[PDB]
Design a protein around this nucleic acid. Structure first.
Lengths: 553, 553
DNA sequence: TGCATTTACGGGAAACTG
DNA sequence: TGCATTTACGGGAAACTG
């Protein structure tokens, strides 16, 4: 809450206060050297027409006061550095991690307003300290003498003030929204050669003499040593309009921003790399956008510069799945050190950290993430029976390496289930009708429940296209549980034709010449089908109407 | 058969024969002026060391023989013109119509070999007649005299021979295969901005001193006055490599050809036309490819030139349907006169001519066209109860203008039915299982047939997506026909999910608590379902198998 | 020879301009 | 304001190159 923000805030007032205060002192000193000027100039020349002593004791004040002014700036400057350290190395830093996490889903990041505020106040305050060092520069360029407080102090001061300004502005230039294809908005750090994508820069030092002044140019792979060292490294060029100029309009509430839309990548086919497909890493190489600009002024010439988070580049949305797998692993095990050679030695993740991201994956796309018992199932797929919250899942295991006995990788498996929910199960998923992930051993051991006529909804473990199922329980006459019963899993092909509610409503089980049955009374504990799936059912010389319907035996 | 071909052929021998024959005569004359030369030259100068008369009577022969030579070429030339008329204005002409018809489906066109033959023989023969006019040019450039048969004849002859050659070669240059997108091979005169398409030129005068000599360049809309006169006329540019050179290799069996692949159109967005969408004609404007080249030689400089059939240009295969509608109507009511302003006043077609094309539409895509009773149904849709084979179907009626009461045009309706067969009904269509087109009045009046358990397959008349149905007959107890019965039509959406054979195999009709029925015993006259659709049916701790199935009530 | 990655095109939907 | 035509992108399959 206001744990730091209050502290921090406090300090920024402190600066602002000190700067005014200098500013009186400068006036009063701007007076007293005049007053002297007047009285001296009438008294130096005088005889052209009871002690006292004005000239000897009073002069003193043209010393005293200047000393007090000079020493007093120095105190301000020293403070300002403390402040500026707190604000650049904690405050901003923290926001940027917070944003890293927003990208792979996770708690949404706060606005850049509060920050923009501090940054701008401390950046105004310096600017004022700039001018007074020039007003004192003036007084010296009136009157000077043996030891002139403002002749020893002049250059060190000037140099500090600018040193400070420079660090300050440099740090403000920041990627307010990282690169993204519009047609893929939950998937923001993967690009495809061809499609257009958007970036937003933003400066935090909202002055008004920086309006239509800064011209940002975009670059790509600039200074990436992995072009020479890594065999097979692709190369590209940005197509759209790069240069934009950064302006207060457009984005509301000030914000001195620049929102590129219409940017594109194209590969640089030049043989060259010769696309060695026997190299170090598949297309999970990371590549980096860069932005550049420069703040030109009377006596000022600041180069700015920054960098998106590492990006992945693909050709075909076929790849996107595996592509997002790489952006997860990096924005989860890396603080920012742009480690474009990360996948050469990709470290292991702890189960405790994995799980909360796996959850984020569903919470972002739907309206409900992965509960506890669910997670324990995927726990055990990766980790074994002993699924401690410390266990280490290696990057092979999560992504390129078949599960226990199957012909697919684990991440590809979830990725499909996730795609199925998105386009055929949202309503049932939002509303908690689906258990989804549950072992076919704890699923029996929870169906010695009730009325021979209860059924769960699972996700097939054996598919690759991602596929829902259902299981129910009978009475076998032996005085015990049934073998229980599950139907071959409904994938997209069936589901496209009739809905999964409609399937359930009307399933039959048939014979030769027997009235056909309907063995689905109860959803999980006790819910009568036509209440659980009530609201999702569709609808309730003269063609006769038909329905599709799924049937067994 | 060999009705003309024999005649024609005959004549071409005639030419070839005459040319040899000249050729002896030229030799024997090439001798007799020598012989004279020898005897004269010994006798002119003689005294430097019984009558007779050699010099006076014999000389005569240097006249006689030359006269006979000269007159004799003239006979050849005169003949050759007759031949060349027959071959250019009937023979070629006919082939080209034959090809026009191949494009909208129809009897496949013969090879260009036979033609290539004639063309080449008559084109060799001239070439020889070229040379002898130069061998006689020589004899004159030996010896001459009062009336020299070959001084009056020299220029007229020379000029004729070339006049002839020129017409001959000009006519050979011909579009052996008209433009087409590979991904759309039954639809060859419609192009889409973006896709690549192919053309083949071919010359018919297969000489060997025209190999890597002729460089064909492609053009587009060249000399099309409908760019200035017609408001809204689009414009374009060919992208790929235009110039190709025409070579004997590549295409086997000689053939001096040039097969462009990789050609593309792009619109010329330049405002300009300003895309007035209140002009004369929708995108059914016709546009024309042109080919050009030039046959450069010692003393010869022939410009060649030709033109594809009019083409239609679209943006999106959405349009292709209506697009093909325009290519049908033109290659059916127009002999070739490139009437790019045809759709401004589009004439009416007679039912007799329509029908055979409508048939061609199915015969081309499947393996069976439209029988007689079928045609009579579409007869009556367009024409009325009185569907004479002379009735006039106007172009509105066939294409842009709703049917009697419906919300679609007739051609769009067939176009859909046609698309349905192509991707879900081929086998049943090939094998005559489907009546398809039959009025819902003659369909009752042919189902007071038999065992309450017969059913046809129709095509819905009310769809727009194109949709099959089935109807069957009962027994009502009243001692007469049933109301009969038809199911709401199965379109692509159902059909994609389960097949139309599988539908039929298992349809049920259901109740609350009654065993469900199967009212489809017999296909049309008497065929037991499971024989008619026998061969098309699919197939005949442990998931339990299901099926989709269509059900009524 | 096989697998990985990229291209090319169809179809659907949104965007554009008259 | 509405309709026609074109663009932009996803997904599937073929083509390419190591």
């Amino acid at each position: 809450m206001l744990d730091k923000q209050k502290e921090l805030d406090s300090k920024v007032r402190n600066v602002k206060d000190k700067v005014m205060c200098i500013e009186h002192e400068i006036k009063s000193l701007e007076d007293l050297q005049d007053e002297y000027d007047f009285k001296c100039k009438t008294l130096q020349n005088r005889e052209h027409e009871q002690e006292q002593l004005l000239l000897k004791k009073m002069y003193l004040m043209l010393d005293n006061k200047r000393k007090e002014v000079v020493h007093k700036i120095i105190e301000l400057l020293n403070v300002t550095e403390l402040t500026q350290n707190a604000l650049i190395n904690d405050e901003l830093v923290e926001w940027k991690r917070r944003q890293q996490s927003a990208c792979i889903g996770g708690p949404p990041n706060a606005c850049l307003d509060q920050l923009q505020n501090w940054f701008t106040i401390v950046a105004e305050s310096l600017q004022q300290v700039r001018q007074q060092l020039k007003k004192l520069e003036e007084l010296e360029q009136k009157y000077t003498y043996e030891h002139d407080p403002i002749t020893k102090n002049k250059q060190v001061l000037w140099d500090r003030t600018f040193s400070l300004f420079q660090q300050l502005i440099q740090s403000s230039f920041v990627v307010e929204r990282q690169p993204c294809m519009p047609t893929h908005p939950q998937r923001p750090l993967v690009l495809k050669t061809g499609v257009q994508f958007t970036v937003k820069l933003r400066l935090l030092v909202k002055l008004q003499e920086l309006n239509y002044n800064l011209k940002v140019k975009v670059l790509f792979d600039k200074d990436v040593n992995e072009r020479n060292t890594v065999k097979g490294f692709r190369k590209f060029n940005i197509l759209g309009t790069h240069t934009k100029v950064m302006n207060m309009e457009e984005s509301t509430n000030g914000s001195l921003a620049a929102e590129f839309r219409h940017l594109q990548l194209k590969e640089q086919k030049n043989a060259g790399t010769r696309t060695n497909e026997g190299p170090l890493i598949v297309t999970e190489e990371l590549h980096s956008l860069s932005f550049e600009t420069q703040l030109c002024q009377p006596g000022l010439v600041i180069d700015l510069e920054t960098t998106s988070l590492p990006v992945v580049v693909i050709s075909n949305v076929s790849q996107l799945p595996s592509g997002w797998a790489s952006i997860l692993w990096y924005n989860m095990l890396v603080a920012e050190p742009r480690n474009l050679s990360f996948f050469l030695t990709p470290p292991c993740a702890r189960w405790a950290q994995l799980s909360e991201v796996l959850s984020w994956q569903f919470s972002s796309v739907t309206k409900r993430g992965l509960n506890v018992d669910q997670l324990n199932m995927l726990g055990e797929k990766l980790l074994g029976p002993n699924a401690s919250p410390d266990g280490l899942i290696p990057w092979t295991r999560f992504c390129k390496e078949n599960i226990n006995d199957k012909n697919f990788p684990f991440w590809l498996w979830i990725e499909s289930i996730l795609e199925l929910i998105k386009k055929h199960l949202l309503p049932l998923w939002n509303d908690g009708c689906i258990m989804g992930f549950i072992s076919k051993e704890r699923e029996r051991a929870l169906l010695k429940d009730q009325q021979p006529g209860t059924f769960l909804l699972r996700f097939s473990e054996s598919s690759r296209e991602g596929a829902i199922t259902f299981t129910w329980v009978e009475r076998s006459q032996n005085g015990g549980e049934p073998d229980f019963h599950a139907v071959e899993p409904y994938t997209k092909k069936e589901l496209s034709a009739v809905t999964f509610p409609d399937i359930i409503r009307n399933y039959k089980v048939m014979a030769a010449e027997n009235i056909p049955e309907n063995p689905l009374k109860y959803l999980y504990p006790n819910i009568d089908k036509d209440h659980a799936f009530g609201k999702y059912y569709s609808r309730p010389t003269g063609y006769i109407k038909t329905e599709l319907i799924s049937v067994s035996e």
